[PDB]
Amino acid sequence: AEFKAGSAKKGATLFKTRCLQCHTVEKGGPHKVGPNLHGIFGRHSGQAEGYSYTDANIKKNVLWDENNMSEYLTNPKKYIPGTKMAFGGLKKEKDRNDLITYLKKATE
Ligand code: HEC
Incomplete structure (x- = not known):
């Protein structure tokens, strides 16, 4: 909703414990049950x-x-009704800020 840059160090920990089961971030990294996320920012969904x-x-x-x-x-x-995944969300705004701060660098 209203992103503000936080701590990528914490964000990297959040990624490992909440995302990495289903996603990789490096260019050329494998898909898992979810897509590799390199280049995700600035790109249209599904690509x-x-x-x-x-x-x-x-x-x-x-x-x-x-x-x-x-x-x-x-x-x-809630944002994409019908999306399929065994993932329930990061409910805390502060966690999302930290995660996204890491993800923006990690997928760049
Ligand atoms: C397995 C239980 C997953 C967890 C843990 C995470 N994600 Fe996920 N993600 C998963 C699937 C199966 C899909 C595709 C769903 C579909 O309807 O086809 C996704 C999708 C995303 C996307 C969208 C990618 C795009 O539009 O190209 C993003 C941006 C994404 N996932 C990010 C993300 C984050 C940041 C996670 C940890 C907080 C995370 N995912 C966990 C499966 C799973």
């Missing part, structure tokens, strides 16, 4: 090469930035 998305994730057609990413991560199935 990781080699990954097959749900209709819901494609049709949202959101151009990812820090703010819509923070809303999405709060509750992905």
